């Protein structure tokens, strides 16, 4: 029931092209963005870049617009499928670029395509896109995710030595996903006054997705200032930590440099072994309950050592790119116990859907997410709600690419009223609450 | 007419609660949210926070959202007016209120609630926005309006002893919209490469409108700065640049202090006279072709002389702050020759219609602003193009709060095709295209 289809290149929250999709239908106008990351895994799906110096240094998506335009969309429209068979018109795409790694038409042409045709269809099926999400993915009960927000920015996303790359709060602890609002609200403006009055006003700016970018080295001093600010806002208990190491960022042959951003010094260097010792004091001295990327992308020894000597989630994003083929060598190897889940990283949401199944069905946490590079799209706050994941990170309650989809579930959450739960301790595996 | 008004409080972009409405009409839902405003003044609309310390640092609006569901909605509900009916449906909201300032249900309410009605007539209209609001104001030759981009930051909005507020870049040169938005963000990009390589990376972070703070204290640096970039851009016959001094958070003892970020020494005081002498050399060493509130809010024979003395664009902010009848001594003092339209500094769709129609009618600019809470909406960027304002500042081309509004502003161009116009090198008076 596709009638046409027009993509167009739009700016994301950083100020680089991405790709926009408007998609119609009988019911009207539906229109999906693009997101992009920063620190990407060397295994995510190809996102297609033109490379014309002479336009915005290289990064327009030209090409990917034109594939859109001139080649899915006729196929799409010629294939007569409604846009409620979401696998049919993925899988046609999927086809139609022939390629393991999208690299025909980019990952990034073909899931513009794939999100403006899943919102089509919910609307085809008169109903809110969490909803026809949960039908794709086959669950009824819903329930809101516990927020995990950024709220200090390190590595590949900020402006100072800071290496590990993000610190985020988690407000288990909340009544309701709106009161898990308030409370990461209130601890990202004690966070502020707290770095303010340490570090003084130019320590207040903000990294690429809304948290403060401090001029600090030590990781810990980080996770120092978080407890501060969260004990500071009377939330102690209520809310607790969690963090993205994005270690592919500073792999540096075996070892991993933690102030990569500085005049490289081999001598600073440490191994995995150390690396993973200094995780056990971050979550000894600190309620950190989450760890993402604490190992390099291909460094699977030190993945599976480490999880097997924790209580708490290990969560893969470069390990494991969303992608069905590498989260079956990480349950194998038991590499980590939760996947981030970007429909970016592998493509389409027929495939993000499955990445997220797999996960699920192997015991493993689920933690849907956005990318350093966001756009004014909120896709992933419904799909979040949808997969009954529990969890989600989009970002420091600051800069809209964030707020967006804070708002947005907001907004579900009223609109299910009794019928959803709010996550809270279950995180990890909210499908108890039901 | 209106079927339900339904307000709730969701973030801005910096964190702070505000106000969205969800307006239903048999055309279906329309939504909009409001920018960051004030609780206190005497010529502008002040939005109503909560006030509990307890709660949101006490920056909630709970009471705004009740008195739009508990009050605005039933009233609207009833009258059984059409949502095309802006002028008819926000003057109601405004004897509901009773107050000068909509100090009672508060300026984000009304708004929230205006704005939502002006998406809904719209649609009954079979329009989109900007053509809407083009019919609302009279207007029929729609033009697309110069970007200007905060990429440098200062003042109180900035931990550095720079006292300038806002430095700006103006694609001026842009062939279109489109293009205008890749100058400004090859330029933003190459901007944040000159201040690593000068300042190093730990000032390569922004502030709450996207742009850069680093730490100077010149405000000819800034400008050196920017000038660098568009150069290293290979822009520059193609990008000049806007200036908001925000000069009344200076102002001290009737002078002016170029460095209040500093323990207090009123030996460093300027005059206004030698503050304008300092503007003049900015306008003669670097391609400053617009100064917002270049004097105090109240300093109004500063303004009057400084206007008659040069032939840059002169903007009105903390001067008019988008009030007609401030607007009206602005005008006939000679004060300035352009208006900064910030819709939620008056309150209602109507009455920022009626105030910019009120400056272009006697010969004065008018650049459509946001405000540095922002939220992702984007009614300013059909705003703009429906009032033909010719130029708009929504923010550096980073952080989506500000993004939204450009992309919107992509996408109308893109939807009037042949009939697309770029303000150019006349954003100051698109009225000649
Ligand atoms: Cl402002
Ligand atoms: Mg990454
Ligand atoms: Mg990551
Ligand atoms: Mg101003």
């Known amino acids: 029931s596709i009638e046409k289809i ?6 994301d929250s950083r100020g680089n092209p991405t790709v926009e999709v408007d998609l119609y239908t009988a019911k009207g106008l539906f229109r999906a963005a693009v997101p992009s990351g920063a620190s990407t895994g060397i295994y995510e799906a190809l996102e297609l870049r033109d490379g014309d110096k002479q336009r915005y240094l290289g990064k327009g998506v030209l090409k990917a617009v034109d594939h859109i335009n001139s080649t899915i969309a006729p196929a799409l429209i010629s294939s007569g499928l409604s846009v409620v068979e979401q696998e049919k018109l993925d899988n046609l795409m999927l086809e139609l670029d022939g390629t393991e790694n999208k ?12 999100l403006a045709v899943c919102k089509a269809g919910a609307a085809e099926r008169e109903l809110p896109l969490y909803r026809h999400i949960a039908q794709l993915a086959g669950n009824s009960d819903l329930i809101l995710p516990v927020p995990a927000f950024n709220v200090i920015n390190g590595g590949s996303h900020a402006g100072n030595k800071l290496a590990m790359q993000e610190f985020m709060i988690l407000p288990v602890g909340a009544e309701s996903f709106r009161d898990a609002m308030r409370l990461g609200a209130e601890v990202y403006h004690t966070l502020k006054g707290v770095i303010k009055d340490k ?12 948290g403060f970018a401090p001029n600090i080295l030590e990781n810990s001093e980080a996770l120092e200032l978080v407890k501060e600010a969260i004990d500071k806002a009377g939330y102690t208990e209520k809310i607790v930590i969690g963090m993205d190491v994005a270690a592919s960022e500073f792999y540096r042959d075996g070892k991993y440099d933690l102030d990569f951003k500085s005049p490289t010094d081999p001598s600073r260097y440490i191994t995995g072994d150390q690396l993973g010792a200094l995780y056990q004091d971050f979550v000894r001295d600190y309620p950190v309950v989450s760890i993402e990327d604490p190992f390099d992308q291909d460094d699977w020894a030190a993945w599976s050592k480490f999880t097997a000597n924790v209580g ?5 994003d470069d390990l494991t790119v969303t992608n069905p083929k590498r989260i079956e060598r990480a349950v194998e190897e038991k590499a980590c116990n939760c996947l981030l889940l970007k429909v970016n990283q592998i493509g389409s949401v027929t495939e993000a859907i499955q990445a997220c ?12 997410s956005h990318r350093s590079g966001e756009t004014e799209d909120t896709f992933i706050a419904d799909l979040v709600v949808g997969l009954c994941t529990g969890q989600i990170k989009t970002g420091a309650p600051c800069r809209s690419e964030r707020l967006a989809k804070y708002n947005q579930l907001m907004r579900i959450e009223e609109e299910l009223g009794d019928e959803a739960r709010f996550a809270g301790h279950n995180f990890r595996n909210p499908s108890v609450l039901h």
């Open 357 to 368: 199944k797999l996960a699920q069905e192997n015991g493993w946490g689920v933690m849907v």
């Open 312 to 316: 708490i989630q290990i969560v893969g």
């Open 199 to 210: 570090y003084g006003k130019d320590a207040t700016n903000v990294g690429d997705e809304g």
């Open 103 to 114: 690299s025909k038409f980019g990952a990034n042409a073909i899931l513009g395509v794939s």
């Open 6 to 11: 027009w993509a167009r290149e739009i700016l």
